C-alpha cells in the first residue's frame, strides 16, 4: 500500500533535485548572458534568499499542516518552474531578486516533501520510507552535478542549456507531483520539551552550525569565482560539488554505522569538528590556490555533516515522531534568524557590505567562536 505513494514521491524528489545548472550559477549569473557583477550578486541579490526563507517559513509550516501536504508540494513544483523560467529569461538585478524570493519559497515549501510520508504511510514503514526519500534526493543532486560537469567538459555545452535541462527536470517533477495520493489526515490540524537541558543544548549547537553552513554554502561559489575567474580559467564546480556531497553522505553513514557513547564523547568530538570547519574556512580564505580552496570546501562539508549527524541523533534520541516536526521547525527557524542577522550585519548592503574576500574570514572566526564558547563551562 505504501509502495505507490513512496515511488511517486521519490520520483518527484529525484527529478526536482536533478538540476545540472545549480553548480554553475555564479559562472552563469556573472557570464556574458546576464552580465551581473560579483558585488551585485553577493550584496544585493543573494541575501534576499534568506529574508524570504525566514519570512515564509512559519506560514508555510502551518499552511502545509492545514491545507494538506500535496497542495504544498504542487506549489513547490510551480515555484520551481517559475524560478527556472525567470532564471532562463530574466535579466537585471530586480528579476534576480524575484528569483531569490521564489527560491526561498521553494526552500520553505520543501518541508511538505518530508512531512507528506507521515500522513500516508503506516508508522511501520516510516523509517525505511524516509530513508528512501532522503537517499534518492541526495543521489539526484550528486547525479545532476556530475552530469553538469560531464556536459561542461566533454560535451562543451553552455550554461543556458544546463538551465534548460533543470527546467525540464522540474517540469517532470511537477507532473509526477500531480499524481500523489491525497493525504486524508494531518499531524496537528487533523489528528514544553525544551525543558530538558540536553535538548536545548544540542538544538542550540544545531541551529548555530546550520546557520554557519548555509551562510558558507551561499557564497562558496562566489569565493571560487574570486579566486579563479570563470571567464579565463577552467572551473570544476560540478565535480567539486559532487565529491563534496558524496563525502558528506559518507560521513553521515559512518556516523550512523559506528556505535559510540555520544553522551560523553559528543561535546569533545563536536568541538573538534567545529575546529576543523573553522580551519578549513581559514584555508579557503587565505589560500590563493584554487585546488586548496576546493579541498577546504570538501573538508568543511564532510566535517559539517559529521557534526550535524551527531547533533540530530542527540536531539532526536527521545523525541516522538509527532514532536520531531515542531522541534526541528523551531530549530530551523532559529537558525534562519541567526543567518538573517549575520547576513544583515555582514553581507547586506545596509551592514558592513563586506566582499567575499573577507566574508570567509568572518565565517571561520564564527565557527572558531562557537567552538570556544561551547568548550567552556567545564570547570567552576
Amino acid at each position, epitope marked *: 500500500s505504501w509502495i505507490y505513494p513512496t515511488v511517486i514521491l521519490c520520483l518527484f524528489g529525484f527529478f526536482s533535485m536533478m538540476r545540472p545548472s545549480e553548480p554553475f550559477l555564479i559562472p552563469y549569473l556573472s557570464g556574458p548572458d546576464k552580465n*551581473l557583477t*560579483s558585488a551585485e550578486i553577493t550584496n544585493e541579490i543573494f541575501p534576499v534568499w534568506t529574508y524570504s526563507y525566514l519570512v515564509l517559513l512559519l506560514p508555510v509550516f502551518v499552511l502545509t499542516d492545514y491545507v494538506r501536504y500535496k497542495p504544498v508540494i504542487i506549489l513547490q513544483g510551480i515555484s520551481f518552474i517559475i524560478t527556472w523560467l525567470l532564471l532562463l529569461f530574466g535579466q537585471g538585478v530586480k528579476t534576480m531578486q524575484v528569483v531569490e524570493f521564489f527560491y526561498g519559497m521553494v526552500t520553505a515549501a520543501e518541508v511538505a516533501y518530508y512531512a507528506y510520508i507521515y500522513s500516508v504511510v503506516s508508522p511501520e514503514h516510516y523509517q525505511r520510507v524516509s530513508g528512501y526519500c532522503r537517499s534518492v534526493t541526495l543521489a539526484a543532486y550528486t547525479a545532476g552535478s556530475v552530469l553538469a560537469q560531464l556536459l561542461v567538459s566533454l560535451a562543451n555545452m553552455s550554461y543556458f542549456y544546463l538551465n534548460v535541462i533543470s527546467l525540464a527536470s522540474v517540469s517532470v517533477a511537477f507532473l509526477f507531483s500531480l499524481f500523489l495520493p491525497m493525504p486524508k489526515k494531518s499531524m496537528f490540524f487533523h489528528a514544553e520539551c525544551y525543558s530538558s537541558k540536553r535538548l536545548f543544548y544540542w538544538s542550540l549547537w544545531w541551529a548555530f552550525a546550520t546557520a554557519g553552513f548555509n551562510q558558507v554554502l551561499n557564497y562558496v561559489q562566489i569565493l571560487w569565482d574570486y579566486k579563479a575567474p570563470s571567464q579565463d580559467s577552467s572551473i570544476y564546480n560540478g565535480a567539486v560539488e559532487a565529491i563534496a556531497t558524496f563525502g558528506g553522505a559518507v560521513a553521515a553513514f559512518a556516523v550512523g554505522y559506528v556505535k559510540v557513547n555520544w553522551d560523553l564523547l559528543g561535546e569533545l568530538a563536536l568541538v573538534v569538528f567545529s575546529v576543523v570547519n573553522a580551519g578549513s574556512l581559514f584555508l579557503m580564505h587565505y589560500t590563493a590556490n584554487i585546488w586548496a580552496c576546493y579541498a577546504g570546501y570538501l573538508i568543511f562539508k564532510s566535517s559539517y555533516m559529521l557534526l550535524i549527524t551527531i547533533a540530530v541523533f542527540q536531539i532526536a534520541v527521545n523525541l516522538n515522531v509527532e514532536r520531531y516536526a515542531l522541534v526541528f521547525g523551531i530549530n530551523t527557524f532559529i537558525a534562519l534568524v541567526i543567518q538573517t542577522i549575520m547576513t544583515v550585519i555582514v553581507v547586506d548592503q545596509r551592514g558592513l557590505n563586506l566582499p567575499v*574576500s573577507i566574508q570567509f574570514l568572518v565565517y571561520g572566526s564564527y565557527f572558531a567562536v562557537i567552538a570556544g564558547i561551547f568548550l567552556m563551562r567545564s570547570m567552576y
Partner: nanobody, 126 residues
C-alpha cells in the same frame, strides 16, 4: 574639501561609444564610493554606475548594464566610464559623485553622496 571634475561628454551619433572621466582632487581618495548619475530634461536624477575604490566593487543600473563599464585609473585619481552602443535614451547630463565609505551606505541613492560634480552633457543624435 573634495572637488570632482568631469570631462569627455559631447555630441555622439547614436550607436557609437564615448568615455567620460571624473577626476577627484583636494584629498587622498582611497576609501570613497565613486558613482555616476544622470538627469534628462523633464525627468529625475538616475543612477548610472558606481565603483568602490577600496575593493574595486562595481554596480550598474539595468538600463545601462552590459554596455557601460566603470573602472579606475589611480595614476591620476580618476574614475572612468566607457559607454558603448549609445542610444537616444542615453541623452542626459552626467554627474559624478563621491561618498565616504561607511556603515550602511546606499550606493544607488543620490542622497548618499555629498560631493557632486558640475555635470557633463552627453547628447546622442540618431
Amino acid at each position: 574639501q573634495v572637488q570632482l571634475v568631469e570631462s569627455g561628454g559631447g555630441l555622439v551619433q547614436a550607436g557609437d561609444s564615448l568615455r567620460l572621466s571624473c577626476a577627484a582632487s583636494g584629498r587622498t581618495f582611497s576609501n570613497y564610493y565613486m558613482a555616476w548619475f544622470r538627469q534628462a530634461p523633464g525627468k529625475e536624477r538616475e543612477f548610472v554606475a558606481a565603483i568602490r575604490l577600496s575593493y574595486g566593487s562595481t554596480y550598474y543600473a539595468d538600463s545601462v548594464r552590459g554596455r557601460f563599464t566603470i573602472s579606475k585609473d589611480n595614476a591620476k585619481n580618476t574614475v572612468n566610464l566607457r559607454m558603448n552602443s549609445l542610444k537616444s535614451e542615453d541623452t542626459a547630463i552626467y554627474y559624478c559623485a563621491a561618498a565616504e565609505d561607511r556603515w550602511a551606505l546606499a550606493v544607488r541613492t543620490a542622497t548618499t553622496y555629498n560631493y557632486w560634480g558640475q555635470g557633463t552633457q552627453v547628447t546622442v543624435s540618431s
